[PDB]
Amino acid sequence: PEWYKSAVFYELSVRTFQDGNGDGKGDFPGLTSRLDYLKNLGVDCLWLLPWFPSPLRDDGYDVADYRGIHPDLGTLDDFKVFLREAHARGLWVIGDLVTNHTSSDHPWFQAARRGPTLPDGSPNEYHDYYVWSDEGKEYADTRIIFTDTEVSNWTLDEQAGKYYWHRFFASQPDLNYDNPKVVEELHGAARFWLDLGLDGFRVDAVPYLIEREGTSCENLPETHEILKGFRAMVDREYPGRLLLAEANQWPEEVVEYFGTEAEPEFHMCFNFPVMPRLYMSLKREDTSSIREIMGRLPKIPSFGQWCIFLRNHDELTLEMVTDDERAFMYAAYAPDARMKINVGIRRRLAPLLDNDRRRIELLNTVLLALPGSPVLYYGDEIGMGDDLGLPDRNGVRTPMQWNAGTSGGFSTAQPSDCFFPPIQDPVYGFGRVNVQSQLQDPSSLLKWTARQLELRRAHPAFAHGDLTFIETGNPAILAFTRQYDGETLLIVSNFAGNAQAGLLDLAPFVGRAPVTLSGASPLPVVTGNGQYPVVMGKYDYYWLRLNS
Amino acid sequence: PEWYKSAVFYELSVRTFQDGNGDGKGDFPGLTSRLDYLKNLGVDCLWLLPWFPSPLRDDGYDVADYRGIHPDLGTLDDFKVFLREAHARGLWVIGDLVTNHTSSDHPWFQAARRGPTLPDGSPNEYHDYYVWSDEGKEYADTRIIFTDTEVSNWTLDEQAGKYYWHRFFASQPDLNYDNPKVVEELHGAARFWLDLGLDGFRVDAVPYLIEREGTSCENLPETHEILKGFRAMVDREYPGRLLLAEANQWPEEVVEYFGTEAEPEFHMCFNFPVMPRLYMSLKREDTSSIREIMGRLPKIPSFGQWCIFLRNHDELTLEMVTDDERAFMYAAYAPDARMKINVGIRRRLAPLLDNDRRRIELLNTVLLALPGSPVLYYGDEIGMGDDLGLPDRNGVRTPMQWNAGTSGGFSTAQPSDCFFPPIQDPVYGFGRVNVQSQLQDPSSLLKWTARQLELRRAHPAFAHGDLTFIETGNPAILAFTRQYDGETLLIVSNFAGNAQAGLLDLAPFVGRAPVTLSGASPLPVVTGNGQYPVVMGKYDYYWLRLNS
Ligand SMILES: [Ca+2]
Ligand SMILES: [Ca+2]
Ligand SMILES: [Mg+2]
Ligand SMILES: [Mg+2]
């Protein structure tokens, strides 16, 4: 019933998607010119990365003005026409709300570092917007997220003569959520955009808002309380809008970000826990880690929906796996040391899978078949690669590859003048991987993706169904049912690189006939004790309905 | 065994493969520079299209000098070094021997058209090298092969004042094999090349040598007798050399080109009969035509070996199928009328299969898994397309696509200066489809092909085994065994575009365990009555061994 539950999401970065004025930077007019492509793909909601004024030290997640549009992306008018046109096509759009911190170039912080009092005796009302310390000795049981860059979560400010807190880069000072004026400022920022018609927000780094002595400073009850506040505001003032949480934590802690029926928080949260186990299972040819980790996720509220994903603008995060699992992933998916960043792996989806289309298809089917609303990362529809020559996580944020012309069609500016260089290598470069090609190619990955979303869209049980794992007698083979409104789907997936045999426990479905979702080819009726023998080719996916 | 039985063949055209001197024309030095690529691919024998002097009215199959090298391709020295280097790498090489006719520019024909007697009263000894008629009324129960171009197999020569015979173009007059001088001329031509160390010949258009009143003028006993003469000569003078027949006929008539143990003809013949049924079965999702047509092929001599192929330098021939089968193929594989030529379809393999890699892989596995020695058509290993803007069958003979540089790496001459233009379209063009890319791409089609030939090479039962079709209870699924030297291979192939179920009749193999040839994953042991249930994903191939 709520729109987000049946939507397909698409994550993109305006500066990196389409340049409309030849300066090497993506912009809103450019994005707007590509809306037909997104609609045709089968996308329903666009999630745009931060578009606000910013020195871009963390690519826009260091925000310097919550109520504007970064100059290189265009103007606020350009934004309003973009939104009009998106809505004209039946697309929703959500922004990225950066709550935990601002840029050090935010006027607030420039004001705040003047000290507790102005030179004229008056109180500096902005000073307590941020989190200050005399010695930087507090919150010591606290981990560092940007392990490769920051040595400490406290940094000394020259002119303020005190240490300030930051969970991310030193140029991203944390906001102080014990100060109620800060809560107002952000309720107000969100309002500004929701008043223009924005359909919601992806909310950034939600676990880290409140910090408390003698705790990890993650997932604190007071942090959750503030988030309940946001949801309460939106429910009252902007019914129907979406709030989606970036909360990368273990299952028990992630689910709490939905809140409860009585005290709601987020409508949606990313399913961070399943994501690594997908990759792990593929290398191990053993899907048990998927069932285990999915099994640890409690039921969610009635309004709740998972956002399922494979990759995104960040590294493949390994922060919320065991030390053994982390080491395995590095060994398997980060052979070069240059591939690691801050407890994670900074590679695009296709390279991670050795550009093996069968493996790419497989994981995409799992993405679309698990319970939640799926999100695609821009460029993965065509099999884009990465560029590890770029610092930080920018190697997975190269320009979208539209055609084989100048700079992949992203801009008329030459490749070395683009904000990030478009990829030109013989395997993943825009000469070989681009939209124009794949639109004309009857069997391209783009076309496959669209066809597969069409298929999903035609079976609501994917969006809304329950989930029940089936025993297969072979850990390489992952089987489950999705049931909803009388419909029973059976999804069988082979994570091995060669043919595999299984014995499915279909005892609950004796007497019923499985048929392929695609073309209704019938398989043998389920008989006897219901132990159903199968064979599967390498990386096969069987999308079935059980007819009664 | 004989070398040809375990060889993998590769068909290529020198003018079109690699240019070494920037004139837009492929040549021998160029070819020689690409021998490592062919060896590494897993090729054993190169079959070169005609390399002889010629006006190229049928792309070199109109021969004007049997004992030379066409100037565009280089010199006779260039040839000798090419051969030495091929042999240095353990590669065999065969040429194309054009027996049935010559160019009208051949000195023989220039001499012959002077008439039976010279202007000085002397007899013209060359006049009877060709086949002449006063009225062109003879051999009227005879079909026309180039239906789109030729209205008659007789053509009036201006200066000779008589009609001459030609099964092919009017510029390709048939040689007269009732004149024994002609037989000597060609025994001699073959000798010239075999003396240089050439390992054999593909022999062109063998059914059409002798023509007789009141017959079809195809497959005549006197034609076969002459071919026995060629074989006899090579067996005596050049033991170990290969003779491979182009004989496109129905099963009963093709097999006769092997001759018998007592009177041998050809070592190898192309398996023309199976080829169309492969394509048909895929569209119909019903493999019965393959079993039917394979079933009609009699056993062949001990020295005999089939040459299995999917495509070649000609059209996809529909001359030897039923009228109903022909109409179906046109409907399914020739939607544009421009795609038909002379009772066939002039398209490359990948375009025929909608560039669907799964379908490409499938047919390739079948090519490699049927009994015979397989032949690859140059460029199909990377998924090359075609150019229907070129006349006749030249649209499948575009330059090999080596890299994304100038003219696909085929030449430094620009694309409009190449002999045939290298393909530039967004789907199949050299920017997207080339060797360099696929060598660097871990999961490319090139790499797949090589990996799959490796796999074949490791199981001699593919080359030498018998063949037995297995009952599957589903026409979409084609199963068979190949047995040799105690080894039993089981090959199961799905020709449907969605998942299929089968029940394999493995009664003869109760108690034995099928394992994947690739990685030895075991499947359930064959039990009970031996009726073995399977499921297959779309276009899957299962390559299995049955272990005792
Ligand atoms: Ca904080
Ligand atoms: Ca003849
Ligand atoms: Mg711009
Ligand atoms: Mg040349």
Author numbering:
A (entry chain A), B (entry chain B): 6 to 553
What does the paper say about this structure?
The four or eight subunits in each asymmetric unit did not display significant differences, with root-mean-square deviations of 0.3–0.4 Å for all Cα atoms. The peak was assigned as a Tris from the crystallization solution, which contained 300 mM Tris–HCl, forming hydrogen bonds to Asp63, His106, Asp209, Glu251 and Arg398. In the wild-type structure, a similar Tris signal was also observed. Our present assay results indicated that the activity of DrTS is inhibited strongly by Tris, with a IC50 value of 4.88 mM in the presence of 50 mM maltose. Because of high structural homology, in particular similar active-site architectures and subdomain B orientations of TS to SH, AS and SI, we therefore conclude that the MsTS and MtTS structures may represent an open conformation of apo TS, while our DrTS–Tris complex represents a substrate-induced closed conformation for catalysis of the intramolecular isomerization. In particular, Arg148 forms salt bridges with Glu223 and Glu324, which form hydrogen bonds to Gln254 and Asn253, respectively. In addition, Asp153 forms two hydrogen bonds to Asn347. In DrTS, Ile150, Phe151 and Phe173 in subdomain B and His318, Asp319, Glu320 and Glu324 in S7 all constitute part of the active-site pocket. This means that interactions of the substrate with these residues would bring these two subdomains closer together to form a closed conformation.
